[PDB]
Amino acid sequence: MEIVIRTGSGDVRGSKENGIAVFRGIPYAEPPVGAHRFTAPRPPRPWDGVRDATEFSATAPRPPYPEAIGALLIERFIPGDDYLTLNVWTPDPNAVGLPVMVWIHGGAFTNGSGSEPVYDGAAFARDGVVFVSFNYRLGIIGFADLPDAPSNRGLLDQIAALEWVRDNIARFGGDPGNVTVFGESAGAMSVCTLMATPRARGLFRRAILQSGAGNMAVAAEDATTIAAVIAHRLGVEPTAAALAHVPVAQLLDVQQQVAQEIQGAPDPAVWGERIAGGSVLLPFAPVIDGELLSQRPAEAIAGGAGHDVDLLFGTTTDLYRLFLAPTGLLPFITSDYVTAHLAKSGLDADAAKAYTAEGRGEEPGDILASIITDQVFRIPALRIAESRVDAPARTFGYEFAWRTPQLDGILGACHAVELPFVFRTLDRAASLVGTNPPEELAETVHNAWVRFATSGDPGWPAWNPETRSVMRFDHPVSEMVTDPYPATRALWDGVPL
Numbered sequence: 001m002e003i004v005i006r007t008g009s010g011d012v013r014g015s016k017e018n019g020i021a022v023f024r025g026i027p028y029a030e031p032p033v034g035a036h037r038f039t040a041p042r043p044p045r046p047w048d049g050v051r052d053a054t055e056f057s058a059t060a061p062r063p064p065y066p067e068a069i070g071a072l073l074i075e076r077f078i079p080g081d082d083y084l085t086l087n088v089w090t091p092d093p094n095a096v097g098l099p100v101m102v103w104i105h106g107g108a109f110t111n112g113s114g115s116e117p118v119y120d121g122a123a124f125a126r127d128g129v130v131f132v133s134f135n136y137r138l139g140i141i142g143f144a145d146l147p148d149a150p151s152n153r154g155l156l157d158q159i160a161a162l163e164w165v166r167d168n169i170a171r172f173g174g175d176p177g178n179v180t181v182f183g184e185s186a187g188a189m190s191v192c193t194l195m196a197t198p199r200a201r202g203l204f205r206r207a208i209l210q211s212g213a214g215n216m217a218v219a220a221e222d223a224t225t226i227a228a229v230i231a232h233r234l235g236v237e238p239t240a241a242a243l244a245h246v247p248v249a250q251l252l253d254v255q256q257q258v259a260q261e262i263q264g265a266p267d268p269a270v271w272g273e274r275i276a277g278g279s280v281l282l283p284f285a286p287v288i289d290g291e292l293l294s295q296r297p298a299e300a301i302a303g304g305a306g307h308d309v310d311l312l313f314g315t316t317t318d319l320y321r322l323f324l325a326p327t328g329l330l331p332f333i334t335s336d337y338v339t340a341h342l343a344k345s346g347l348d349a350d351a352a353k354a355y356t357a358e359g360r361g362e363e364p365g366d367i368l369a370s371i372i373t374d375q376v377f378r379i380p381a382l383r384i385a386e387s388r389v390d391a392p393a394r395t396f397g398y399e400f401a402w403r404t405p406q407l408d409g410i411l412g413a414c415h416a417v418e419l420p421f422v423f424r425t426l427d428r429a430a431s432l433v434g435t436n437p438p439e440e441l442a443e444t445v446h447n448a449w450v451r452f453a454t455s456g457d458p459g460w461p462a463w464n465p466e467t468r469s470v471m472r473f474d475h476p477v478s479e480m481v482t483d484p485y486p487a488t489r490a491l492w493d494g495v496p497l
């Protein structure tokens with residue numbers, strides 16, 4: 001049962017059971033404590049002997065999800081400082097050249113961990129894929145921009161994790177030259193950001209973007225504002241030099257206030273006009289710092305970033321219903337609010353009619369959920385695909401359309417429902433997908449992911465602008481569809497960003 005493998009920092013002891021070797025909490029960066037909250041990830045202090053790698057490490061400091069989300073997305077926090085660790089599932093460390101899937105968890109850059117139960121890599125390892133998950137720094141620590149700290153520590157962490165994979169995964173049976181990085185939303189946005197980041201060069205051959213594209217970045221000037229507000233509220237200077245000393249509970253508290261305020265209508269007196277005007281989607285998304293991330297990933301990708309990387313991308317049909325529906329308040333959303341929302345994008349009120357006409361929302365709240373799904377996820381995803389029309393690498397699209405039965409079906413195919421299907425961890429996701437989700441669909445989706453990691457082809461026609469074909473996953477039927485939601489898609493043709 002014990003299995004000892006050499007990492008670049010020393011031997012680690014995992015566990016091998018029923019054909020799968022599992023290593024949990026392999027350090028890939030020194031604990032980011034104090035000042036090192038904000039420094040670039042440091043290689044773990046080498047050790048002699050054998051470091052235990054049987055238990056997941058500490059996870060990154062995160063605030064609890066808002067109660068609405070947190071009842072559906074139940075996070076597993078692991079206390080401690082040594083959280084820049086990764087986990088490896090391999091069917092056999094001695095294997096030759098296994099596909100490697102590196103999971104970058106989502107969680108809006110403030111939440112998540114690589115070690116969440118639903119992200120268990122065993123189903124991947126069972127299918128002949130080396131699976132790697134890891135924690136990267138989150139929130140203020142990961143991404144608040146500071147003049148005296150490298151920007152985007154969380155992104156640096158992901159790079160360091162992928163470099164660990166590059167440098168170590170052959171010892172776990174993986175082909176470092178067949179790495180598929182994949183992630184959900186913030187994790188997929190991270191992947192897009194990595195595509196756009198010179199420092200991530202060559203660290204992955206393929207990418208699966210589950211509900212995240214290249215739009216999720218903080219303008220440097222906004223990140224500066226955000227750090228200034230954070231620091232002001234903490235009563236310290238907006239510097240790593242100051243923030244290194246703030247108890248993490250206080251950090252997370254102010255981080256949460258920033259998150260909530262940016263998620264709402266930011267007070268211009270506190271946030272300035274840009275941020276009040278919505279210039280920030282996620283306040284701890286990667287900063288367009290200029291050195292690590294030179295431009296928004298979507299623009300980098302439009303210019304060819306990641307065009308050598310095979311791409312599987314998709315969205316959940318009703319993604320944003322997760323953020324509007326679970327508390328039963330969608331019916332209160334008004335047409336005029338939706339109209340005002342559409343107007344923020346320069347769309348007329350009757351754009352809502354197109355949503356209704358395509359079955360994407362009867363009531364304004366439903367339409368709003370679909371609009372936001374489009375604005376933040378589906379259209380950005382499609383823009384990346386469109387950008388890749390001439391990419392040498394392949395592009396495949398999916399739509400995850402299976403609707404969770406939770407809360408009387410009000411969530412539809414909402415955000416995160418696809419995750420246990422990808423991972424075949426449906427029994428760990430019942431808070432979101434209910435008690436009896438179709439394991440067949442988990443098999444279908446997961447196997448497609450494995451096939452894509454293995455060969456760069458998930459097993460269905462490639463995406464192109466001609467037919468815009470995506471695999472629409474659902475149960476009982478997952479089938480190809482072409483040019484889905486063409487009328488709502490066209491609404492966005494000329495929308496800024």
Ligand SMILES: O=C(OCCO)c1ccc(C(=O)OCCO)cc1
Pocket residue numbers: 073105106107108109112184185186187263281282323376415416
């Ligand atoms: O609300 C979101 O869009 C931001 C626009 O304001 C949002 C963004 C990212 C995630 C995520 O990373 O989820 C990963 C799965 O746990 C979830 C939600």
Ligand SMILES: O=C(O)c1ccc(C(=O)OCCO)cc1
Pocket residue numbers: 072073074075118416417418419420426427428429430431432433
């Ligand atoms: O989709 C997800 O990411 C996700 C969904 C649900 C859960 C969870 O705690 O379920 C517990 C019931 O088995 C965790 C993660």
